[PDB]
């Protein structure tokens, strides 16, 4: 499977799709989220009646924040990947002011919203989601991609209750070490905080944080200020809730391992150390991939998304930052 997937990915990676729609082809309905250099809107493609999520990036804001290369990485990778638990990019294009990525709409909202409301997920519920992340990272890492943005805010729940990973803004295709300080404080591996060259093992550490947060209802390292979070991470002293199973604690001690020669996902057996762990004994990896497992939770409707202030989309009469985004 992975061999065929790499062939498919490389053809798209080497020859990326460009300019596959236009802003006038979509009716903009409502804002689903906002970020430093734009917003995500629910849109309707008038030709088909399909709903999509449109990520709008202001070129000038990307340039001001020195995020050009990361924005080019995001679109180049997202247009090339194909996996059941990844958001599907349908179109991309740009105009004088903005870049646009149009993705299949995932109506269930963020895992973040459901997790905070419910409090915590039971171990079988958390295991169901964690299995999907394990398979997704096995897929991404096999293509030499590092994701670097795992958190419940970036995991969307589809109509079948399965996950769709979004936000490839920090994704990068890299064969060696990399050094960028990026991610979310609670999810940073110690080697990122300590300004070391790091690798895909940072995604496995982030999975450890995610599983802990899903099962506990709070992350393993938190504090009001990021500097305080970093001190807790680099110490790596993790305390587990009394309701955590012995198998769950063993798995987390292996993922939330400061020692790279000991961290699960980063050993000679790679992902198999995770797949074969006792916590995952009840997991049928193939049925998860095939979406045959009954989901523990089933969510143009935007009710599973928070409300955001609307703003008119202004397109300048002059092209901005043309050379910087020529390949988009």
């Amino acid at each position: 499977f992975l061999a065929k997937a790499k062939e498919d990915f490389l053809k798209k990676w080497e020859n990326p799709a460009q300019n596959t729609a236009h802003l006038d082809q979509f009716e903009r309905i409502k804002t689903l989220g906002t970020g430093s250099f734009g917003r995500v809107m629910l849109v309707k493609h008038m030709e088909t009646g399909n709903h999509y999520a449109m990520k709008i990036l202001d070129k000038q804001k990307v340039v001001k924040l020195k995020q050009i290369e990361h924005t080019l990485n995001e679109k180049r990778i997202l247009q090339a990947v194909n996996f059941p638990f990844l958001v599907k990019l349908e179109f991309s294009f740009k105009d004088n002011s903005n870049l646009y990525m149009v993705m299949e709409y995932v109506p269930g909202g963020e895992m973040f919203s459901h997790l905070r409301r419910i409090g915590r997920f039971s171990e079988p519920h958390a295991r169901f989601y964690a299995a999907q992340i394990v398979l997704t990272f096995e897929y991404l890492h096999s293509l030499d991609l590092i994701y670097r943005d795992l958190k419940p805010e970036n995991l969307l729940i589809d109509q079948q209750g399965y996950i769709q990973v979004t936000d490839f803004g920090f994704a990068k295709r890299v064969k060696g070490r990399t050094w960028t300080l990026c991610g979310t404080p609670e999810y940073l591996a110690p080697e990122i905080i300590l300004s070391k060259g790091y690798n895909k093992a940072v995604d496995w550490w982030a999975l450890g944080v995610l599983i802990y947060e899903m099962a506990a209802g709070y992350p393993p390292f938190f504090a009001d200020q990021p500097i305080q979070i970093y001190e807790k991470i680099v110490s790596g002293k993790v305390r587990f809730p009394s309701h955590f199973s012995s198998d769950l604690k063993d798995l987390l001690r292996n993922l939330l391992q400061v020692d790279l020669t000991k961290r699960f996902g980063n050993l000679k057996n790679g992902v198999n150390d995770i797949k074969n762990h006792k916590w995952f004994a009840t997991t049928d990896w193939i049925a998860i991939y095939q979406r045959k497992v009954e989901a523990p939770f089933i969510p143009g409707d935007t009710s599973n998304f928070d409300d955001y202030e609307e703003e008119e989309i202004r397109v300048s009469i002059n092209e901005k930052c043309g050379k910087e985004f020529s390949e988009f």
Binding site: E153, C182, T184, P185, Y218, F222
Partner: peptide
């Protein structure tokens, strides 16, 4: 409790990237 400490913290909302 750790849960009460989390809920009273300023980090329960959507977390921004660094």
């Amino acid at each position: 409790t750790t849960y009460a400490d989390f809920i009273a913290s300023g980090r329960t909302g959507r977390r921004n990237a660094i």
